[PDB]
Write a protein that binds this ligand. Structure first.
Ligand code: NI
Length: 326
């Protein structure tokens, strides 16, 4: 079966613009990122401050911002959790959903910043919203039934040993709630013709989940045959940015190959799982192998690789622009 939305390839002009990264772009991304480079364990004041920063940043861009807040039992007792859901045009039937988690692991050995996991993805989602604001507010007025939605899940990390019951608190809770929230085509703006919408989960056209990003030379693969058409757009975008000489490399005449033109047989538990079980198509942007720094106290600011982060920003900006035809 083909992808339900015809994926029009990005004009060269637009590929070039989305692939430019000014010095002001860098500075703005880095300033955003600084806000996330703090321990933000569930229940903590800093966690509250990060949640508030996300909320304010996006209300400032005129997005609709809601919070799914609840208390859940954990191996450490009751804990408050709040998912943050920002939607550019609430009434648009279909959402391109970009996501990541904003809580950081409670590490037994000491203070854990979780720079790749996932302070970087958090900043990249806000950066996308801000760098593309003009283009996005224009897309919003088209009435074409498609919009952008940003989900920052809470409580992705286990408190103790990873289990089905100790992990994904926020995503399990939000998938469930959206599944039970019934709606229909007639209630929504411009659903595609062959649509089946019974609940809010059906409006998630594809969920692109960013995780563990920011270390040098990540390797991605297609994890889901269902989203191979979308994943291939990432492969192609990166390839065009390389052709254009828009990627920051150590030496002349290298190319990035982040997005492998293959699929791998790998099972990664992450915030996608509760949506995957409800038939949401998933593109899982997570490196394999994981960064060397994963769940160590070295997952910190100085171990981020800035040229890679800028290269990923180019890819993601050109991808959002291509998907939404910005
Ligand atoms: Ni983690």
């Amino acid at each position: 079966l083909k992808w339900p939305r015809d994926l029009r390839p990005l004009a060269h002009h637009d590929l070039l613009y989305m692939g430019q990264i000014s010095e002001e772009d860098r500075g703005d991304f880095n300033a955003t990122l600084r806000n996330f480079l703090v321990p933000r364990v569930v229940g903590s004041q800093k966690h509250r401050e990060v949640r508030e920063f996300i909320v304010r940043s996006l209300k400032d861009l005129d997005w609709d911002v809601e919070e799914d807040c609840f208390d859940g039992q954990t191996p450490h007792g009751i804990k408050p959790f709040c998912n943050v859901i920002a939607t550019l045009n609430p009434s648009a039937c279909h959402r391109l959903v970009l996501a990541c988690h904003y809580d950081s692991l409670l590490h037994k050995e000491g203070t854990f910043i979780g720079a790749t996991d996932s302070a970087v993805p958090c900043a990249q989602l806000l950066y996308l919203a801000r760098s593309l604001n003009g283009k996005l507010q224009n897309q919003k007025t088209r009435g074409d039934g498609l919009t952008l939605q940003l989900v920052f899940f809470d409580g992705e990390e286990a408190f103790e040993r990873w289990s089905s019951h100790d992990s994904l608190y926020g995503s399990r809770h939000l998938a469930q709630k959206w599944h039970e929230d019934r709606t229909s085509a007639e209630r929504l703006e411009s659903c595609l013709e062959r649509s089946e919408i019974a609940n809010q989960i059906d409006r998630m056209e594809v969920m692109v989940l960013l995780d563990l990003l920011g270390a040098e030379n990540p390797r991605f693969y297609s994890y889901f045959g269902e989203t191979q058409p979308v994943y291939r757009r990432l492969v192609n975008i990166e390839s065009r940015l390389n052709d254009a000489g828009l990627m920051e490399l150590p030496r002349r005449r290298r190319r990035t190959n982040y997005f492998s033109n293959s699929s791998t047989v790998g099972f990664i538990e992450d915030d996608h799982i509760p949506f995957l079980k409800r038939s949401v198509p998933i593109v899982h942007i997570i490196p394999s192998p994981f960064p060397d720094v994963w769940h160590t106290l070295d997952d910190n600011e100085q171990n981020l690789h800035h040229p890679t982060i800028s290269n990923l920003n180019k890819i993601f900006k050109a991808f959002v622009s291509e998907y939404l035809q910005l």
